[PDB]
Design a protein around this ligand. Structure first.
Ligand SMILES: OC[C@H]1O[C@@H](O)[C@H](O)[C@@H](O)[C@@H]1O
Ligand SMILES: OC[C@H]1O[C@@H](O)[C@H](O)[C@@H](O)[C@@H]1O
Ligand SMILES: OC[C@H]1O[C@@H](O)[C@H](O)[C@@H](O)[C@@H]1O
Ligand SMILES: OC[C@H]1O[C@@H](O)[C@H](O)[C@@H](O)[C@@H]1O
Ligand SMILES: [Mg+2]
Ligand SMILES: [Mg+2]
Lengths: 730, 730
């Protein structure tokens, strides 16, 4: 009420020019020259900035606020996706930890580092569910499962904001992308999303909800159509659901030019009508295109919008700036004016031990034939592949203020680990792609892919020599970061062809072969799974990537990471995901069942799959009672044992099935998990509690109710577990 | 009244045992031995038969009806998909004609032939819209566009039934599959369908509606879930939409065991509860599984169903049998008991001139480099490929009572054409697949593909010899019919690997190359499009396939056929189709648009694409008026000229765009077309009439309304190349 009183007072004093100015979100570029945007903050025509990210630069613009009548402060935002200056695994990587704390840790440091440079807000977390591997931004998300993505969506918000949004070591979480962006048609970015309302509520919205429940201060609106309505103009989404059904009190922010793009969507004839549609749907902040500033004065002066529309928008900005504390101290995150200069990129502001301890948790052991891993630090080891010495690629897509040169490549990481106890032979082995059209694309803007000018065959001879000169080969292969990024959708899911040639040749030398994969999406790995001797999924593991990868290769860390997005046998099985419906004709032999004929059926690697240097056993699953009363809770009991001879971590998973329902329900749904560290011979009893809240689903009219009847409870170390116990709900 | 009085009388007379008996649709098998089901028709426990298809066999069972108390007659049904005994192109083939009367002709003869053998009903037409090329049953449909599929869906019903359903040369049309079956997830048959209701009404339902509007006597319910509800138990679909919104008076028929499959869908705990769900949703007839007969007596005796449920079902059967005339004369289609047994498969009952004149219309010219086609009948010609001499493959999937040996292969068709005026060299060149697992599948049940036991390399040397010995090669390559059928979903869209090797080799001999393709779905043809000198798409062209194909190869017919389903550049661009939404970031090149980076963008061949031995010109498009009044119609005027040097057919197509709408509308939609035969130098003015009815779409609340504003009118010879003019609706 103190806040409402303060805001109302200020708004009662503001001209319309000034209330509309508060909605203008810009960045420095050719669109907005810095010296023209400085003049505009002075005349009170700007509301916030993004992509300005250093203390002297934020201060230099904040310092313009004083020349304006109402002296209203800016906030600054940035794409703090998976790190500011120290870069953690890409989010898909982080998810594979199966540990909130680990994810939380990555978030806190990001905020710490961002706030340290003067940043008020991160456009993060990206929380979009993804079941189509072809999509360029699958990297940014946490995988295919609702339960886990929703869970981690909250953890990220809580960590960024903490308990006080005005704390100078806290940033506001602008959760994205609202909504359904990840279900785009054909995995083409920006493409049509068409979905039933029961699937919309059960599977794809819950993560956006959990961000509002954790108190996210802002929401970024997606670029996709929903059932034919662009989210930028979707009053159902931004008003009915977000505001009234969900009670979001915060700020809505447009995507980059998403308001003028209503012309290309075919919802507006021109800019004037695009502005109207967006402001009236529930869009507070207008990113970059400046439509709001050009058209809202004439839209109001001709009675096409209500003052109440401008007022709800302008009031949502000031409420953000107030919660951040920028009305108390505009410089609360920019230091005091005497304070001494410093180097922004100094090694002394990084958090390497953090980056390294996180990146360890997310690596996934896909194959290890006859205990080849872990490697000993003796003899000669060949390091071949175009990503071995790649700095720019390990820190993945959306790297923020991340610097390539400060990054530990997987070559350097191997050097650091062996010291002088073994020898490393390096050969590039292949460029990342043989296709010049693909190379032209990745280097259109900035040189981010190394092109070795030597013939492909030249590089291959060198590699085979190097391999014959070694005890075993370690192959650093897969995508450059520019391949799993915004607008970079793929029609193939295998390792690029130039590198698969390299892998065929290396296989032909008979020397044991270890595959180290870098990638921002699942990959088609049918060949590699039958040929190569061991495979490590390392995603893009960040600034301490190489170090974390070495630790796992040399057994300093027993890999514990597991898949949160099923691995297709080819681009032509898309989509596959663990929580599909059984259909009327399930494949279990049989020609006349739901299947392909021309390839094996199922995902290559199921959801929740990962190996360990040690072996684990689960005892028979016990349920407290076989009939549950309404309001009561149920207990699921199982003993996890490390029966191998190495201290290692697994992830014990709880799946539910509702086998008889008013809807057709998935064969399996994730409902809980416990990440457990055990010494050899060490047991550990795990306890799962199951309430009514766990048993609910959205029927045809969105009635969110548990139905009485049998339920199936599954406990195992991956979704490929197939034995359960049953209880009856009364 | 006569009918109502007759039915009411009979029903007032029937015990429950007998009214339930009327719902039992069975066929002869291990489920139902012939001599046990004979005993059952005598105790009045059977209602209809399917898959019994010869006069003596139908008579032998009809003849059992006399020993029953109420002497109620059976009807007999069969899968008359694209022919009974004379087999026309597969439906996708038929569609490519762009001529209703041609399609009508195929339908009439089918009915003629079917009724001749004693058949009352065909489970046809299949009318499901298909945008996913991987799906096994794409062959059965008419392609991806709503307007064209809806149009032909009615033509098929009208032709099967004629003007009188009791006529002994008419059958009843059971339209399928209701509903949305073709949008299955990942192209996997029987798999989940999830769709928004605005896209459901605009794009996928209209063809089922057009069949009810043409007076279809029956409707078959699909096996797919819709937004989580199995259609077999979907009261919204079978009662609200079908009965009360649409006013369907007729009969609903289950898919094969689709009622017991509600257990595997996860809607029912057991059979008893599956029966209840289905009978109460709107399912009259129970195909094969016999659940209705086992459970309806106890479901009614315990008040789980209403007598009104049994009565609505039993009344819908008798209404069908009455309309067919089987109460007037049970043998009206089974002759008088005087004639000789006669041979069913006699040459004198076929319709070859029909089959040949249809199959000509459906062939599509995809490429012709420097007028290589048409061929002269004047030298040596190599005929290579595993489908050149293939009888079983030309008559495609769902060939009914069709006989392979009566069919004209593409080899034989070429022999017939050249007589002794030119010389034919044959080499198989490759089996249809190199993969033994694929060959094992296609020959699981019946020997459908003859496998040459020689090594792949052996066959290839033979082919290259044959090719070197000739003036040019004609290659008969693509799918066996077992590859485009129910349950046969593909992960690849190219010609099988064994045959692509064969085509690379043949290309390498320098000899001019003609590709004759056989296939039941679009195919990935990027290589063939850049290499081969000409390509002909022949689908599976039926009993007179070879003859029709020769006629086109030797210029006896100028190819006029055009594509009704866009051709993907690879399985990884699925789905593509001409009537997609523009999105906010359209590509036509930028990086940040809705696209792939690792392949060229767009379909290989767009919807409505086909070439000709002659060339055609369209004059500037003229509109009747700049501004249309409500209730008024508009005229669209264009002059088509054959400016080439041969008499040929093209197809002039009318596309509409609504560029500003409450919904995001497709970039282009089909609204009309005119197939025009022209002599060289010969012109023809075409007139298109455009009403408000043409400009409607389903908004977010299913308001079927045209909005005032600009509309874009496009006329051209394919969805790709075009010119447009704009008009305003007031
Ligand atoms: O770069 C700022 C913003 O640009 C938008 O177009 C992207 O969709 C967002 O993920 C991003 O936060
Ligand atoms: O117009 C292109 C813009 O689109 C945004 O979504 C991208 O994230 C920006 O980096 C880019 O400048
Ligand atoms: O063959 C009888 C019927 O069986 C069903 O299960 C198929 O899906 C239909 O296509 C067919 O008409
Ligand atoms: O699965 C049993 C039956 O199902 C039908 O849909 C298929 O078309 C038949 O070939 C098969 O006999
Ligand atoms: Mg239940
Ligand atoms: Mg309009």
């Amino acid at each position: 009420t103190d806040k409402e009183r303060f805001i109302a007072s200020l708004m009662a004093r503001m001209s319309n020019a000034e209330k509309i100015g508060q909605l203008r979100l810009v960045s420095v570029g050719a669109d907005h020259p810095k010296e023209a945007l400085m003049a505009d903050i002075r005349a009170g025509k700007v509301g916030a900035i993004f992509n300005t990210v250093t203390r002297p630069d934020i201060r230099a613009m904040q310092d313009q606020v004083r020349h304006s009548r109402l002296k209203i402060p800016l906030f600054h935002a940035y794409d703090v996706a998976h790190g500011h200056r120290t870069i953690f695994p890409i989010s898909l990587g982080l998810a594979a930890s199966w540990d909130p704390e680990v994810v939380a840790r990555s978030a806190r440091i990001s905020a710490l580092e961002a706030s340290a440079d003067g940043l008020d807000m991160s456009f993060s977390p990206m929380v979009d569910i993804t079941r189509d591997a072809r999509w360029g931004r699958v990297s940014e998300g946490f995988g295919e499962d609702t339960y886990l993505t929703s869970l981690l969506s909250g953890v990220m918000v809580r960590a960024y904001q903490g308990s006080n949004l005005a704390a100078p070591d806290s940033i506001m979480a602008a959760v994205k992308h609202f909504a359904l962006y990840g279900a785009a048609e054909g995995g083409r970015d920006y493409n049509t999303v068409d979905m039933s309302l029961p699937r919309m509520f059960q599977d794809y919205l819950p993560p956006y909800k959990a961000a509002v429940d954790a108190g996210a201060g802002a929401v970024m609106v997606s670029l996709n159509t929903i059932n034919g309505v662009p989210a930028t103009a979707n009053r159902w989404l931004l008003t009915d659901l977000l505001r009234q059904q969900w009670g979001f009190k915060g700020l809505t922010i447009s995507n980059h030019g998403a308001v003028k793009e209503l012309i290309k969507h075919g919802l507006a004839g021109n800019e004037r009508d695009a502005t109207r549609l967006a402001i009236q749907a529930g869009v507070d902040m207008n990113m970059n295109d400046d439509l709001y500033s050009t058209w809202l004065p004439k839209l109001l002066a001709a009675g096409e919008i209500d003052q109440a529309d401008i007022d709800r928008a302008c009031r949502d900005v000031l409420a953000a700036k107030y919660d951040l504390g920028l009305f108390a101290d505009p410089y609360r995150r920019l230091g005091k004016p005497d304070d001494p200069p410093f180097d922004t990129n100094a090694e002394s502001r990084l958090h390497r031990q953090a980056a390294r301890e996180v990146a360890r948790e997310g690596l996934v052991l896909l194959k290890n034939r006859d205990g080849l891993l872990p490697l000993k630090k003796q003899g000669r080891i060949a390091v071949i592949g175009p990503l071995a010495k790649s700095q720019r690629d390990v820190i993945g897509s959306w790297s923020a203020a991340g610097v390539p040169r400060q990054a530990v490549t997987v070559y350097q990481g191997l050097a650091n680990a062996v010291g002088e106890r073994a020898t490393l032979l390096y050969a590039k082995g292949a460029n990342v792609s043989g296709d010049q059209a693909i190379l032209d694309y990745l280097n259109s803007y900035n040189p981010e892919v190394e092109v070795d000018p030597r013939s492909a065959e030249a590089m291959l001879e060198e590699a085979l020599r190097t391999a014959r000169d070694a005890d075993l080969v370690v192959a650093v292969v897969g995508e450059s970061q520019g391949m799993a990024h915004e607008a970079s959708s793929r029609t193939d899911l295998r390792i690029p062809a130039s590198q698969r040639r390299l892998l065929k040749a290396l296989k032909a030398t008979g020397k044991p072969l270890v595959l180290v994969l870098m990638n921002g999406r699942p990959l088609s790995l049918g060949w590699e799974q039958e040929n190569a001797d061991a495979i490590l999924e390392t995603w893009f593991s960040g600034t301490e990537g190489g170090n974390a990868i070495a630790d796992v290769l040399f057994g300093e860390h027993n890999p514990s990471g597991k898949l949160t997005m099923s691995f297709p046998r080819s681009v032509g099985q898309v989509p596959v995901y663990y929580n599909h419906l059984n259909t009327g004709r399930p494949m279990d032999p049989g020609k006349y069942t739901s299947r392909y004929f021309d390839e094996a059926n199922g995902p290559l690697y199921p959801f929740g799959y990962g190996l360990s240097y040690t072996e684990f056993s689960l005892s028979p699953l016990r349920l407290s009672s076989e009939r549950l009363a309404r309001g009561a809770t149920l207990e699921a009991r199982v003993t996890l044992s490390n029966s191998g001879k190495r201290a290692g971590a697994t992830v014990v998973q709880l799946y539910l099935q509702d086998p008889v329902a008013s809807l057709s329900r998935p064969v399996k749904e994730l409902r809980g998990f416990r990440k457990v560290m055990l010494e050899p011979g060490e047991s550990r009893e795990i306890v799962f509690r199951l309430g009514e809240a766990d048993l609910k689903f959205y029927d045809s009219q969105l009635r969110h109710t548990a139905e009485p009847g049998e339920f199936k409870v599954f406990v195992g170390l991956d979704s490929a577990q197939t034995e359960s116990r049953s209880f009856t709900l009364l």
